[PDB]
């Protein structure tokens, strides 16, 4: 109980320091200087070199290390890209290294569907659009998005679960705070038809809480209870309907959530 008591005292001291007249004035003074500095360098940012230099340093792979892309900012980035961009014994063993494997068959199939497909190209699309879109819809109970993305089997599991929440008169309003480790874990063939699938894993920080529909009070979870969940998705691409605006052929066959633990 000492740790809980210390946390309240530490929060109270920080709150008192933040709410202190000197602290509030100091915080306001620091904020004002930062705003002026950004405005001062704003014309510098307008220079074509700054875009050239920033794209050199950042380039957008900083998203590998975390960060959640807001739904609105997620749509504009995809729309803008779509408008312009997206529009002896050793030798025998060494030979077996270069030989065709099951993962080689899976990636080759997806390359016929889309000549631009690659492990690094799809992982960027997963990291930037697909995973944030699905995870945000999953925690917020957005069945309209999941209907397009999920297959018949995982969606019927989701709709069955969301049905239970209806007779409890509760609705899900969760948040995704940060998505990490978005990667293609494995590429396997689904027996016995050898359906090529991509197993995708990710780790996301989230707040899972439910509110009563009629009033809005808390019914489950907590307003401030961050969890480090692990999500496992199995992806396949339909050779047909690859011209879909939203999913462009991708379809989730399995969606598993596990390994949730507290985080901060």
């Amino acid at each position, epitope marked *: 109980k000492t740790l809980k008591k210390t946390g309240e005292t530490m929060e109270h001291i920080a709150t008192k320091a933040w709410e202190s007249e000197l602290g509030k004035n100091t915080r306001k003074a620091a904020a004002a200087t930062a705003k002026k500095l950004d405005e001062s360098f704003e014309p510098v940012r307008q220079t074509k070199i700054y875009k050239e230099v920033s794209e050199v340093i950042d380039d957008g792979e900083s998203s590998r290390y975390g960060g959640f892309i807001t739904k609105e900012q997620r749509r504009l980035k995809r729309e803008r890209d779509l408008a312009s961009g997206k529009r002896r014994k050793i030798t025998n063993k060494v030979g077996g290294f270069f030989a065709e*494997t099951e993962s080689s068959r899976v990636y080759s199939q997806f390359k016929l569907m889309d000549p631009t497909f690659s492990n690094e190209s799809f992982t960027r699309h997963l990291r930037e659009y697909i995973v944030p879109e699905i995870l945000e819809a999953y925690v917020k109970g957005d069945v309209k998005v999941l209907k397009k993305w999920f297959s018949e089997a995982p969606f019927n599991v989701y709709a069955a679960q969301q049905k239970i929440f209806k007779e409890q008169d509760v609705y899900a309003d969760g948040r995704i705070l940060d998505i990490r480790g978005v990667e293609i874990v494995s590429a396997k063939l689904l027996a016995p038809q*050898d359906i*090529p699938v991509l197993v995708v894993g990710c780790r996301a920080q989230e707040i899972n809480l439910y509110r009563k529909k009629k009033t809005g009070e808390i019914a489950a979870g907590d307003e401030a209870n961050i969890l480090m969940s692990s999500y496992a998705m199995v992806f396949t691409r339909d050779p047909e309907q690859i011209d879909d605006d939203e999913t462009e052929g991708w*379809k989730i066959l399995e969606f598993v959530r596990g390994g949730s633990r507290q985080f901060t």
Partner: antibody
Amino acid sequence: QVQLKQSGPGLVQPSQSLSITCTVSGFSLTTYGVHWVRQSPGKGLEWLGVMWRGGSTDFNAAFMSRLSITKDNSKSQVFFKMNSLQADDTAIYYCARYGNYDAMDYWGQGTSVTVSS
Amino acid sequence: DIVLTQSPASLAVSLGQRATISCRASESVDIYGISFMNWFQQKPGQPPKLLIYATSNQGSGVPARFSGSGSGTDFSLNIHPMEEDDTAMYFCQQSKEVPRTFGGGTKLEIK
């Protein structure tokens, strides 16, 4: 490239056994599987059994008591065998490698088998 | 199990026009929304040659004039424009469940 060779005997005596060896080349039996398909002129194409990519077999329910499909990874060979044959078992027997979406993409040259005396 | 009925049993069309072959399945052949219908072509003295797999995908090296369509239980193969070479026996084969079953075959000829 990928190429499947069959080595089986024609003119099988009635109530005897037919054995066909499908020697594959250009791919490994570990990563690909081989179907066994029959084409009678009075019954058309019909599927007998499959040597799955994983290494298990599955047979047609009408031939399950007679069929026997075994493979050998080292020699790249698939072995087919029917215990008893009659006049209606006269057809051309194909071994077909299957790929993604169970596409029988490569086929053997076929083994025309006649059951007579 | 899954009986594939193929129509018509025979067909004769002139060069340059479209030849349509239909396959109708007793059940549905869908797994995960993908229809596992394959189309084969067999010349008289040769093994069957795969044309279409997963109901719409050209086989390796298949000319673009072969097209697969359909979903549910109704499937079709279209040859257009037809050439002199592609006169053969055409089969539809499902791969949803064992046993794999083939269609009756459609003899497609020239006028």
